[PDB]
Amino acid sequence: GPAFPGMGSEELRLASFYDWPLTAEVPPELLAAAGFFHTGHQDKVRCFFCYGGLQSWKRGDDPWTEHAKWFPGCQFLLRSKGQEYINNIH
Numbered sequence: 001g002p003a004f005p006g007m008g009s010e011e012l013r014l015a016s017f018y019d020w021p022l023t024a025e026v027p028p029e030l031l032a033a034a035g036f037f038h039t040g041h042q043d044k045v046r047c048f049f050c051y052g053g054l055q056s057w058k059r060g061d062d063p064w065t066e067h068a069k070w071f072p073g074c075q076f077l078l079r080s081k082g083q084e085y086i087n088n089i090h
């Protein structure tokens with residue numbers, strides 16, 4: 001099951017980005033869709049399922065790609081995107 005079931009809702013995850021500092025550079029819509037919520041500190045986000053954290057986002061970073069790059073064992077990632085997607089990133 002998820003590490004943090006309370007953030008399993010995409011809508012709740014999106015709401016968490018109200019004070020996101022990088023709206024143009026990395027859209028909250030994409031971050032939330034990819035399982036991430038904003039911690040509220042700097043640009044630090046975390047996946048509700050695997051609890052993997054990511055920071056220091058660069059302009060044009062793709063949340064799903066970074067999710068698969070750093071946390072390829074996440075079951076939310078697997079269910080959402082499939083194994084072929086994860087394999088291709090590695």
Ligand SMILES: CN[C@@H](C)C(=O)N[C@H](C(=O)N1CCC[C@H]1c1nc2c(-c3ccccc3)cccc2s1)C1CCCCC1
Nearest residue numbers: 039043044045046052053054055056057058061066069070
């Ligand atoms: C360029 N794209 C971005 C999204 C990215 O790849 N970020 C990575 C990342 O955040 N990682 C790598 C796996 C672990 C994670 C880290 N999280 C933290 C946190 C952290 C703590 C709580 C929540 C979120 C992040 C604090 C200090 C260092 C790291 S490295 C690295 C890349 C190399 C420079 C430092 C960050």
Ligand SMILES: [Zn+2]
Nearest residue numbers: 047049050074
């Ligand atoms: Zn995850």
